[PDB]
Amino acid sequence: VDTHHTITIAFAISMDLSDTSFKDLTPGESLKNSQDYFRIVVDQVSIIHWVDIMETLREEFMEIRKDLLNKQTDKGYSVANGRFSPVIKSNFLELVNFATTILTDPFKQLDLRHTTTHVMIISPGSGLFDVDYSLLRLTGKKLLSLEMTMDLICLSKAPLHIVPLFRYRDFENKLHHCVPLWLSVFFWNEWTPRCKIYDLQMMGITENELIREVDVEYLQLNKKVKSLSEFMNDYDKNAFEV
Amino acid sequence: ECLPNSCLLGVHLVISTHSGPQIVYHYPPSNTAFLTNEEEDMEVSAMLQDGKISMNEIFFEEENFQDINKILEFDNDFVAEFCSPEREMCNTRFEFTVDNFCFLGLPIHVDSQGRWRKSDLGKNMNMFHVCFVMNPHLIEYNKRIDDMYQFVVTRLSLLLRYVQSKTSYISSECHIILKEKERVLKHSKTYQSIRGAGNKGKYLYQRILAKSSLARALTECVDKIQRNEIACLEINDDKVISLQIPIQNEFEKMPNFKLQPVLRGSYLTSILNMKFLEKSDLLNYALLLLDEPNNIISSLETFSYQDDIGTIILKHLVRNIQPNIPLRSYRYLITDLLNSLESSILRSCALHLMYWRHARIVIPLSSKYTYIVSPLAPIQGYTIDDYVPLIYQNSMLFRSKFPSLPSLPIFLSLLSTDKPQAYSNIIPSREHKPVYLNALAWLIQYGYVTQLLTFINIRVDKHIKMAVDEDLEKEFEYDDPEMQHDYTIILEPERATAIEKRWLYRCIYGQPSDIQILFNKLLKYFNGKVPMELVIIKEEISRHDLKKLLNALDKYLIEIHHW
Amino acid sequence: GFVPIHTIFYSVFHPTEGSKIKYEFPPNNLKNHGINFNTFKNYIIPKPILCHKLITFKYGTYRIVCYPVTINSPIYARNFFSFNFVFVFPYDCETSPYEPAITRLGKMFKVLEEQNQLLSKSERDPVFFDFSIQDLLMRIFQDLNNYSECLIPIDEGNAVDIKIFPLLRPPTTCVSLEDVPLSSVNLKKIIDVNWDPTMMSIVPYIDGLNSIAKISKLSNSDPGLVIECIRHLIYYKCVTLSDIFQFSNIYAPSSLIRNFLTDPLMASDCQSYVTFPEVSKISNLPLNKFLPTRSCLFDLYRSLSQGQTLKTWYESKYMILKENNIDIRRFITFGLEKRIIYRCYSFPVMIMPKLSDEEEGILEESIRNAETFDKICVLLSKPKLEVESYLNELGEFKVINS
Amino acid sequence: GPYNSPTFGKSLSLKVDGGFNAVSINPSGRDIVLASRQGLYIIDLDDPFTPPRWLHHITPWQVADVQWSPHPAKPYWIVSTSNQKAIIWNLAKSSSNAIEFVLHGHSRAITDINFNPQHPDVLATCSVDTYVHAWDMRSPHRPFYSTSSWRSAASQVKWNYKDPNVLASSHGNDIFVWDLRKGSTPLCSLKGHVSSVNSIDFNRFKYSEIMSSSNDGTVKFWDYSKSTTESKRTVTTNFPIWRGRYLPFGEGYCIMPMVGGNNAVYLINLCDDNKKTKLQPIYAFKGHSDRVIDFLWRSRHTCDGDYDDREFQLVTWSKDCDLKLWPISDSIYGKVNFDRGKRLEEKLPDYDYCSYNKEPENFRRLRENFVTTSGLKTNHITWLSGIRMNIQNLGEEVSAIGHKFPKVVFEKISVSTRELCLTLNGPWSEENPDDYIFLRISINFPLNYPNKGDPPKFTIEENSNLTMSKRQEILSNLATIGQKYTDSNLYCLEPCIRFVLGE
């Protein structure tokens, strides 16, 4: 199209500092102990230097694991520690507020050759995010007061629920689901598997240790039945209830 | 997948000369989106009226048409370039995939000496390729391509090689196809008076199919393979070829209904065609026509051209057939027409009928046999492979065929609401017996009703064990509980040990000699695998003899009933 | 599982001598096996119509998978540059797991050649214009033949990350509301944070006796999403469908009833399965008012028959189950799970409170589709007797226990 | 004991079909494990005629490495890679559930696993996801040490024999030496290789010597106490090297090719003073029509230990599904500077010589015989065809006869105990000559079979269908045939079987 843009690419990392497993995380609650990082790869650079932009992006993505997961201990050596947060528990509203930092002041310096400020979020999730309620309210109030369109793009397949989906817990520990108006979700691409089961796709669970433990029940009685025929009749009468 | 799906999208006719490869006749001229998601007028009118031209009109609709010069987003010269390989890649399997389209064929190339076979276009042509385009899924690609190549492409290409070597038939067919293309595109004013490119191509193809015989063979092959049928093709007006992809409609073990779909009406039997086709006595069984006898005669007249001895014998066997009498009794039908030569002819004709979807093999039907309603009965579903239902359609057909009988719901409820007894308990009188046996053959041929066979296993209690221990000694204790037996199922009594064969022969201790003789002759079949209906037929015993041994040996014989 | 690669070679189009093989691991593997590159050189570097397509063809006993790439730019000689990372496999295998890997390898090298001109500059010859290939091919070959995985860095920001995944059959569309799901695995320990919320809700209710309509009502879920989640669990080979247990059902032995005999662990599992943990109260109820031996279980499994309902079978054999402390639901479930018995479905074909308009509409639609009693009972949320009474009110009907 | 083995001083080849990619050996020298996508095969190296024990674990990805546990107190443990997780097998457990615990570490496929020689309960795993994890088998839930190269996938991980907390890993072209108390920072980074390093190996005698082998044909010897850059020696070959290791005896090293090099394992002396030289091997183990994918060593010695007199046998596994045992001569023992017979500074470890190929086994249940076991062996008769002790064997004779007669059904084949039990249908019915009688014949072979004066013993099971006179006639004719064929010191099992049914 011969567009003349200025791209700005920055990484966005949330690091989990606890040793708790991700399977034990409750749906709706964010990580209590976390550290958030931001690696700006390419600054405000015209898109005619796309070769240099891609080179810097690939080099910094290859170096980000050594940058973050190799912490420095004061004893004179480095210990391989740290874990990236999952997408659902990631710092999504913090990333959006990091994006909206640069539009807080209307009277800033003028980019006299460029017009629109468009923010694209590339995520490996499927539009499901566990968020804080007060931060969600503040993020909505800030995004309704400035000229940005957060175009979230998801590198996973489109899920079975309506996207984007935000799950939060209220002041009474009550789970809620909401779809934000200001976020538009795109997906980058016969039956297609639209639900992610990682431990069965990767075969991460050994066959001897996910064998079924809980079985069919033991046919409990009613304490109102004195005959076997009455038990069969009461089972057939209630075989389709609820 | 057990559901039949011939994955064809079309056929080519790519020939090559010294000047270079070209294309001759391809069909259908439809686009990828539809396939994936004067005197000549009088002749073509007479051929359409007589049924000599069988094209598909949906391939030439306005929304389902692509230009004649384009084949699946490729040019004719492009396809003729990459479907005409070198001499090392010719006379062998040409498999070639372009993303989701597989170009499968067996190209025939002339040798270095100039002979087509080892025993203008007649001398310039050195290669022809009847290329078939398929789009199977990646999970069933090997299966679909293997069955198509084994059952259609190889046979058709070898027959074309033979007729080209002996007659030079494809050369003349290509010449008349190109001549008719030139005479329609550049001479006929009817072509210019027809509106729409699709209708122009339809008229052009009608003229080509009217003048060419190879075009009729290829068109009928594609139309009757995509429709999952037997494709009878006329070649050189002297030889016919029958092509099909076999249908999986027989099952010994019950397939999972709600995990792997299976054709509704499939035969859930332990007696199968494929157990006998792969072996190639079969004459101990009886045939069961899959359609009306006159329809089978009409289909079998298209299996040849000269009405030879084989077609006359096969027609005589189809005309005089009964599903209740074994094929060994039909030696007299071909002794008049001419182990033993007649038994061999009967076997070959039975294989010919049961392979080409004409006459299924069954145990000979009797009113004394227990018949149950199959789980695979065509009750649900609009058609055989859907996934007005089939129960009402077949009830209408049953009422039309038998108007003096209760309805198909009545018959299918009388056979599946009580314990499964013999079929003679539904027939009221002996005058109703033949029409009820015709109804039974109709029920079996439609997959509504299968047979419940009897399987016997042998069981030994503590008394036989103690008697065998006493006999071994010849050459708790304060109580006698009668509900604490020490039993034991001898799984294969032929390969029994010394103690277990003593257990079997102490089960028959005080019985008379006829029970002693019948137990010895039938002991090896008491393993839960041989149905007792086949033992009666093979061992030349009667049912009263067998029912005596079941009654005289009750606590020792395990009764197993399945199909 | 996965076929080993036979020969990997990198073919490039020279502007002078045409298409040629640049590098090939193993060395001289094609000439030693009788594979002549000049026979199929026009498919490795074809016309640009065939380029950027997964091309696979058969050459003798070998299957040759390639992704030809052609880049048109005035920097190169003859206004284009063409290469192909070509994989050779045996013919008698399945190259389907390797095709996305080869396609993505070709696309990634297309991106790299369009970006920084990697493969064209790697030739070290200025005739193509106006990091080692051989080491990369060796690493790809041995890592995919030894680990089914690779991580081979080719630059400071680029690496070849290939993992070969198996291809799975798609789930069927025959799953319906009346089917009960049986989880073959412990689904509570597979749940991580990436699961769908619907599937996470469905998991604590797949107990082997709940219908999909019952699971949808229990989890407050729409039945279509439950159907799709059960389909996804079928796709991973962990949930098998079954039938609603009623005493009006008709069970009959299958052709695999002899597998109760010819199996070293079926009968012992039956003994440990079908028995109550204690002396249950059902084993004290009259009909009207040690573990069980494997022979008893087999004799109970044979005695099922077509047209004889489970009520009649249980009232004919109730001292046997009472004395041996046998749970009839667990007995039937174990028989169905080992495929030694099957259910004969009941079909109400045609020739009490006032039923609602939508209720009578779905009843008429179920009747005109020849649906089973189970599907009608699920749709009306009613037992079999109420459905039978409503059908007798509507017309005369016959039942097929197929 | 290990000194009555029939396969240590002899050369032996076994055909193990199934596509096995990894192999490991018991330090006692008794068992050998082969790993595939379908599971584990445990073969007795003193009884190769018995079919190997199959432990089931189905995975679609190719297995990388298998490793026996060298702990003397835990001789039932096998660590095998199952893609991204390592599986510890308990051979005392039954074959249906032989997995004890699984190490859930790396995200990508585990590439190599090694045991610490000083502390055999410590295991280090390296993987494609650029991580080296050190595990403890006492607490096998999380690794006690994690380190990474962050750029290239690992190929091997090896422990130092002397210093018990130094381990090295090879990641592409680079070799990093890790100190277990120094975190992820490497002690040194050996960076002299041009192509990708395939194998790494420490020196058992020197604290700070490592040999390496890469795809360019270069075998490099390092001494990281002196200099991290450059090498003490550099040996160039004409083939890429897949596995290069130091010799367990003497001063020397053993490298094997990757794709070429005549597919022969090469043994090179290491006794001399940067030295870019060529490969001058002493012995080349010729054979192996397809490439060799691993090699092992089999060691036996005296139990008490006063002099160092231990013998070694090379075990190689190849892509053509052949498992070969190579004897080592005293010429090789002298060409390598190996002092056979020396007062020990420390006594050698003693391992139990127990096999593990045999199947192990242990309201209430009533004692019952539900179904006959006899109503419930072509794999054995096809496995015995691949055994070649390099008709010259009893098992080869049994396999040849089983392939010759498909109708004869074998019920018990035991070459080690020299007992055979075969079932057939023979025409020996006095009532009807056309009737075939099921016969059970049990055959016992002496240890001197088939020498003269040592015939096999034939016992026919008591059959009601067989008359006593016909049974005695058949037994006498079988004894006559066995005595007549053992008189010429030939083999008598095919004339006997062809006599019982048929002529």
Numbering used by the authors:
A (entry chain W): 318 to 506, 515 to 567
B (entry chain U): 3 to 39, 364 to 445, 525 to 685, 743 to 800, 814 to 862, 888 to 975, 1059 to 1146
C (entry chain S): 7 to 136, 195 to 353, 431 to 492, 565 to 615
D (entry chain Q): 8 to 280, 286 to 374, 383 to 396, 400 to 413, 427 to 539
What did the study's authors say about this model?
The SEA complex (SEAC) is a growth regulator that acts as a GTPase-activating protein (GAP) towards Gtr1, a Rag GTPase that relays nutrient status to the Target of Rapamycin Complex 1 (TORC1) in yeast. The wings are tethered to the core via Sea3, which forms part of both modules.
We used a series of masks and focused refinements to improve the resolution, yielding maps at 2.8 Å and 2.7 Å resolution for the core and wings, respectively. As detailed below, the Npr2N-lobe also contains the catalytic arginine (Npr2Arg84). We could resolve an extension in the Sea1SABA that becomes partially ordered and inserts between the Sea3SIP β-propeller and the Npr2C-lobe, interacting with and wrapping the latter. The interaction between Sea1 and Npr2 appears to be stabilized by the Sea3SIP, as its β-propeller is positioned on top of the Sea1SABA–Npr2N-lobe junction, forming a tripartite Sea1–Npr2–Sea3 interaction. The Npr3C-lobe plays an important role in organizing the wing relative to the core, as it is sandwiched between the Sea4 β-propeller and the Sea3 RWD, in addition to contacting the Npr2C-lobe. Our structure thus predicts that, as in GATOR1, Npr2Arg84 rather than Sea1Arg943 is the catalytic arginine and that the SEAC is in an active conformation (that is, binding of SEACAT to SEACIT is not sufficient to inhibit its GAP activity).
